[PDB]
Amino acid sequence: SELNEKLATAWEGFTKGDWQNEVNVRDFIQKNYTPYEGDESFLAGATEATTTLWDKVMEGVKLENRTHAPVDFDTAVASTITSHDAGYINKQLEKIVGLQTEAPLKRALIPFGGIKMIEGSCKAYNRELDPMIKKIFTEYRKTHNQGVFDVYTPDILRCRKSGVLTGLPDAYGRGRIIGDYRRVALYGIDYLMKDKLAQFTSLQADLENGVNLEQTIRLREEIAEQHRALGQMKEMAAKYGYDISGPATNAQEAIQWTYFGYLAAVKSQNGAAMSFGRTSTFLDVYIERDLKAGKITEQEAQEMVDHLVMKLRMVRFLRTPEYDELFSGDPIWATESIGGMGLDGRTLVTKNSFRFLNTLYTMGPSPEPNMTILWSEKLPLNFKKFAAKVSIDTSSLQYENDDLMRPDFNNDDYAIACCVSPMIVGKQMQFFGARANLAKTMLYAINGGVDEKLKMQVGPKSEPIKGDVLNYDEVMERMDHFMDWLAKQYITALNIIHYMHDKYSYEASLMALHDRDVIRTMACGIAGLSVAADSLSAIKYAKVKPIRDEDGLAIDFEIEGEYPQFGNNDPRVDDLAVDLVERFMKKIQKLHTYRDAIPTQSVLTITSNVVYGKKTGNTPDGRRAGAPFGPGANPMHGRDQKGAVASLTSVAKLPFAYAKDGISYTFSIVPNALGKDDEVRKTNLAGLMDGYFHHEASIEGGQHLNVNVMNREMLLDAMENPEKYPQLTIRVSGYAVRFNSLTKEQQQDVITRTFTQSM
Amino acid sequence: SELNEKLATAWEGFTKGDWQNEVNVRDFIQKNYTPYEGDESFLAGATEATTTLWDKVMEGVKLENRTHAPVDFDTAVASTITSHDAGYINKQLEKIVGLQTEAPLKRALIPFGGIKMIEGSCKAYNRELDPMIKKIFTEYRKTHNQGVFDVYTPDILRCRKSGVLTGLPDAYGRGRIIGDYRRVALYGIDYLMKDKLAQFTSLQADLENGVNLEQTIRLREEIAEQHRALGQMKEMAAKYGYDISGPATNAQEAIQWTYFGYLAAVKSQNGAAMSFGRTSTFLDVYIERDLKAGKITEQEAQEMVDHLVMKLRMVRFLRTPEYDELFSGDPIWATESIGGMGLDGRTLVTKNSFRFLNTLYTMGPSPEPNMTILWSEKLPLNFKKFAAKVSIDTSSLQYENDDLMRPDFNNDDYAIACCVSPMIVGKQMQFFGARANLAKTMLYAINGGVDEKLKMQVGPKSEPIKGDVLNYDEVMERMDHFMDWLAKQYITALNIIHYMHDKYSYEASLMALHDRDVIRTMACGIAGLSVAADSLSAIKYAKVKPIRDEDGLAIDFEIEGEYPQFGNNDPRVDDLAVDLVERFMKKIQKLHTYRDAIPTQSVLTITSNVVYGKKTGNTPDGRRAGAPFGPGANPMHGRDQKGAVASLTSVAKLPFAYAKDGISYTFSIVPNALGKDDEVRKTNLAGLMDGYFHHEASIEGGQHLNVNVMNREMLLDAMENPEKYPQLTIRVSGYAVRFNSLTKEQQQDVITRTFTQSM
Numbered sequence A, B: 001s002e003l004n005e006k007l008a009t010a011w012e013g014f015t016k017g018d019w020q021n022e023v024n025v026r027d028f029i030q031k032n033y034t035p036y037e038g039d040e041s042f043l044a045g046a047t048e049a050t051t052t053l054w055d056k057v058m059e060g061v062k063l064e065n066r067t068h069a070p071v072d073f074d075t076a077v078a079s080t081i082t083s084h085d086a087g088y089i090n091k092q093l094e095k096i097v098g099l100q101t102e103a104p105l106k107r108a109l110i111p112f113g114g115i116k117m118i119e120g121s122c123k124a125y126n127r128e129l130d131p132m133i134k135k136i137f138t139e140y141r142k143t144h145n146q147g148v149f150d151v152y153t154p155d156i157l158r159c160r161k162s163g164v165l166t167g168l169p170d171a172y173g174r175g176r177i178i179g180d181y182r183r184v185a186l187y188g189i190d191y192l193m194k195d196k197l198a199q200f201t202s203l204q205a206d207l208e209n210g211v212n213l214e215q216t217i218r219l220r221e222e223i224a225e226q227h228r229a230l231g232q233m234k235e236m237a238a239k240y241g242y243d244i245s246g247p248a249t250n251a252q253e254a255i256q257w258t259y260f261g262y263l264a265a266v267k268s269q270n271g272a273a274m275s276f277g278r279t280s281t282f283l284d285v286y287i288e289r290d291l292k293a294g295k296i297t298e299q300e301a302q303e304m305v306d307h308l309v310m311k312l313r314m315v316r317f318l319r320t321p322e323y324d325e326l327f328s329g330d331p332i333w334a335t336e337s338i339g340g341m342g343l344d345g346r347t348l349v350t351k352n353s354f355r356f357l358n359t360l361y362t363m364g365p366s367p368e369p370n371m372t373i374l375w376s377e378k379l380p381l382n383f384k385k386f387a388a389k390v391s392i393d394t395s396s397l398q399y400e401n402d403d404l405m406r407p408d409f410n411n412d413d414y415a416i417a418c419c420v421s422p423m424i425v426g427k428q429m430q431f432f433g434a435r436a437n438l439a440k441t442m443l444y445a446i447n448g449g450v451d452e453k454l455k456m457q458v459g460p461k462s463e464p465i466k467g468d469v470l471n472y473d474e475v476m477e478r479m480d481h482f483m484d485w486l487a488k489q490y491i492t493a494l495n496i497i498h499y500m501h502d503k504y505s506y507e508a509s510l511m512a513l514h515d516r517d518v519i520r521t522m523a524c525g526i527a528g529l530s531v532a533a534d535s536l537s538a539i540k541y542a543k544v545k546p547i548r549d550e551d552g553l554a555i556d557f558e559i560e561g562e563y564p565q566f567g568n569n570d571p572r573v574d575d576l577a578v579d580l581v582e583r584f585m586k587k588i589q590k591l592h593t594y595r596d597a598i599p600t601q602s603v604l605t606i607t608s609n610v611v612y613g614k615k616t617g618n619t620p621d622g623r624r625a626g627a628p629f630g631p632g633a634n635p636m637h638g639r640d641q642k643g644a645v646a647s648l649t650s651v652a653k654l655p656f657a658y659a660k661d662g663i664s665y666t667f668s669i670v671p672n673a674l675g676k677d678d679e680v681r682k683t684n685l686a687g688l689m690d691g692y693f694h695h696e697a698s699i700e701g702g703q704h705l706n707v708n709v710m711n712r713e714m715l716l717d718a719m720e721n722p723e724k725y726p727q728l729t730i731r732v733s734g735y736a737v738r739f740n741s742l743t744k745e746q747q748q749d750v751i752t753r754t755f756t757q758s759m
């Protein structure tokens, strides 16, 4: 209850508030940020140090892209917060430092998740795993992977095998957790450790009194581990010559301190998505102070942000080839939520909001960080226009509905994890669940649980539907029951996973940057929505004839007549989609979950649209066997043939109320369809999004939107002349990737997607 | 469900019953053992191979004794079931093989429990711990010790430091677990693995249905671990040239198979007590069959037993000096329950009951295994006398009330864990809890929670008792309060401990030899019962005057008048002892425990009588500060002066109904007090015990009795000339030790105890 010298000095000039007496980053931002409604004219360009540093790093990126393999990686060191010595690109040039290992782009071994994935990676890239590391993580330290497979059921293994429930977090970090790295800059490590000690002590009474004994013992051990992690963060920063016991005193230290918090996380956990948070405006408070005090020039501000962002562009994890198939493009999801509006009506847009976007110019286009615009119909027009402009120039940004999420949480400090999943920073997390195959689930309804490809009994043994024609009501009723079964197997698989993940790979350094009690949801994803929705339309508005095999197994279908397709704004096919989202949600919503994580859903697939597509046979909608599904909630490839306003209206109808974990939409529009010149395009793009995201009592609106502005012909050229587009970047499923980083097959999926020609 | 050729050949000649269709070792024993009512005249002597082996082993034992340190031990190998290669004393002479490490008496490193204790052991015995092993168990694989101290409260640490709650299992294996090692001989490993697989599968419904979600997941993973441990048991055996996939076909294999099951235990866990169980009668079934078929002679049968028992005399664990103070004499508690009566009235004594006892003749006196006689007033007099005789010749046996425990359990297949804690084999286990200092809890009541030696607040802040003379009613009221507090701190400490042991050192190889669901009790011990009872008695029947220091702390007590002391069959004081046992039991009874283990109480101390005595100041009964308490439930050193029958009567009055974990009594009587000649002594000892254990609806009777038949003069001679008594063995608290293995301080305790001079 006394602010020492350290805090008063570091906070000189800052406006007072609860934030000075307790951990409350939101309050600090609310009382100190400077809303900015000006334009981009103040922006500086890169320095020589930035260009030199980035150009050198790109040599490693080019090497990664052409070999589709890591530049290098550890084979004899288990990665922890303090295991590696300091590594640099060029120590003399960097303003913000810190690498995962001792060298740029060298990937680490994070064994706590499973030694098998690591062995598989070593084999896939002709490297050899150290015998001791292998022995330790096989016989001495049990891993998340072995724990999950020691408890899985034979049914879950069958679903995994058949492609109905594949790619779940049983062989890679679950991620979906965002520690509030801003806390390190604002309070310094010692303060945070003191606060965790109080949290630990607060559990003593319940522990002694027998109140929820096991949950209390678990949380106390977790807090103890978090506290130990904070201490390791200091040792880690000291390796770089920094003392972070106290709070950041200037802009450089605020950025350096925040990043150090993130660095500890990417050094200790290999979560699928390791998001950064909502930091640009927070950091602007420190930059703004140094500028007014004349301690830094604007160009120096840009350089600091560029060096920070550059490090985020360098985060790497050793993954398996199977991982590569489910999550393509060497993704990191170092997501940053930019802008938004506060609850008080002010815009949370700052000059730093602009400096972050400006990295796409200072260092060229880049898939990471995953810059996400918190869009509001009330953002400054200067910012709305500049964002569209960056989109048109780079196809590197995504947009999410702040007018929808902010009121939903009734909070102006939530951030986006991975692609489209929101969480109040430092107070919420998700138990990541990948996604289930809804399309194949429909086929199981028609084939009595037998897999159309493996002729295996996977779903519960039922009577396959008989007849030369498929009746909507019959197929559907069956689909309903099979959805019940999918729900049960999915929830059970996740209960096991997260029980084991908490036990064998608890994200201590990230959780140390959260409140004592963290809200947890169990995010369940569904793949192939448009395939199943279209499949139900072709059945309900046309004539579908099952082409059965000698065992009476429907291995194909012939369609008589046209049927309405999702993405054209046709209520007939769009209502089936909306309903399907609602149907699965209510189902998982009844089931018991681990640690009482509240079930939620997301229409998101990442590269599963391809994986599940390959493992699913011909479907009622006319889609061929082994054909990629549409990304996330996207209408099937090329089916949304009525222009932009048409497809956006169809997707914008999907209910966020039954998919709180998010709804992904990858929208690609050719330049001329947006306008004759850039001023027209900027204005039209911003106008489209205003309408897509439009929100009111009677209109929920769209949740997310990836925006690619390009001509299909450019990619084809890129495919043949990769060395010509080293930094070409594109939105593919709720995140971006460098086109040259995808495989031939993954590019084939992209080049065959819809390229909106009209408005 | 079909007995292949293996089971058929192996079980040739055995009577059928449920045991052939399910795991049920008790049924196999009931339907096949041969009761014996004859005498010891059939016993053979030791073969030269036996004598040659034992003599070489005694050479290491002498080294251990004179150095009070390990003959040798690992510094770089983490022990598991399969880690070490086969080890022998002399491969050509051993009939039963198997050692913990690759050499006789060499101790292993069992790191899962904690690295600090191993470092401490290395330091104390001048060996250097391998850096790699230290790193792994400090940074990659969290240990039990780490887990506990991460969750402990400052209150528990203060009790640990002050001597009110010290020596709990937070720095050594909990033990108190007896796997049914007989199951390996009877069914073979493969059949057990198949059974465990069914147990695993039987939990799938609940998992899928969300019933006791976290408990079910926990059990499935544990069964997965048990199953895996069973396969390693096979690999371990195979290194010795044995295939234990199938059941034992003869006596040698039945003994070897059973010992192999135990060997997996003592290679993977370092529990304080690693008891053997109730196996002699079980093994008689195989020995008998081989004798009757002429496959082996009686001397050959004795040899196999001797080589098995020899191996039990060689179990060793690397302990710290701190551990050595709490559990003196290099104890193992490889406890074997011999004899008893079946529920059908037949005696369970067999020729093997006699063979086991005979090892004390064939290989001389020995403290391990801890041979425990399950006594009944209805045992065959022939056996009763032979056991009494063996006690007179060796002082190596203990007796426990079969007439009291068999009825309480309604089961004739329960075994003794450690000293006096009973459990139905393969269906029950205890959560070991060591003991609390009841005497200090009384001083705290008088001193307002302030510790009399450390002069610091430990118990709840409270007003010290005022007055020049103490009043029984007041002191007992304050005491009742501090006992409420001790109960809460104690169970809280144990809840944390067992939650952590389950998490970081689950005894898989042992639990693999138990049923799917195991009954668990949370055992709390009390130390200083007689010190506390006498203190109260003195306060109530005499005039106790507190002598206080300037701060009002009662540092001494002067007494006016004589008062009844426990152990003289004087209801005035014995009732106070009975009252304390009842009070504490009703208090812990109301507390929530981890995994719902039923609280139980034991009046047992092991060497905590010496350790707590050193940390406890002058007490109201007259005991001086630093003086040892009485072992277990014993009267204080020398206070029982009215003969054996009286002291036995006092102890038997202690309520087993309120102390289900056991009540230990160490009875020492000079040869002549027992009788003029050998035959008379035997007959009289047997008489005293029938009286002591006498049980009926209104007379519970004693539960346990250590029997030493010796003269104090002999132990004195031994103190000056240890080399003259290399195998001298004495009972000291519910187990035995080689007198030479004790420290001088520990011997002082033993020599100043009561030596009963009359009946």
Ligand SMILES: OC[C@H](O)[C@@H](O)CO
Pocket (backbone or CB within 6 Å): A064, A065, A068, A069, A070, A319, A324, A328, A329, A330, A741, A742
């Ligand atoms: O290690 C490289 C990854 O396998 C590839 O997906 C990068 O594009």
Ligand SMILES: OC[C@H](O)[C@@H](O)CO
Pocket (backbone or CB within 6 Å): A137, A138, A139, A140, A141, A142, A143, B225, B228
């Ligand atoms: O070797 C058995 C171990 O307990 C394994 O299951 C985890 O390391």
Ligand SMILES: OC[C@H](O)[C@@H](O)CO
Pocket (backbone or CB within 6 Å): B064, B065, B068, B069, B070, B319, B321, B324, B328, B329, B330, B741, B742
């Ligand atoms: O390691 C041997 C022990 O230190 C000793 O107490 C045995 O008597």
Ligand SMILES: OC[C@H](O)[C@@H](O)CO
Pocket (backbone or CB within 6 Å): A225, A228, B137, B138, B139, B140, B141, B142, B143, B146
């Ligand atoms: O160093 C942090 C680890 O989690 C340690 O606490 C257990 O090995």
Ligand code: NA
Pocket (backbone or CB within 6 Å): A055, A058, A726
């Ligand atoms: Na370049």
Ligand code: NA
Pocket (backbone or CB within 6 Å): A079, A080, A081, A082, A268
């Ligand atoms: Na770590």
Ligand code: NA
Pocket (backbone or CB within 6 Å): A213, A214, A215, A216, A217, A218
């Ligand atoms: Na728990």
Ligand code: NA
Pocket (backbone or CB within 6 Å): A651, A652, A653, A654, A655, A656, A700, A701, A702, A703
């Ligand atoms: Na919507």
Ligand code: NA
Pocket (backbone or CB within 6 Å): B112, B504, B505, B506
């Ligand atoms: Na273990």
Ligand code: NA
Pocket (backbone or CB within 6 Å): B684, B687, B688, B691
């Ligand atoms: Na008698």
Ligand code: NA
Pocket (backbone or CB within 6 Å): B651, B652, B653, B654, B655, B656, B700, B701, B702, B703
């Ligand atoms: Na009794």
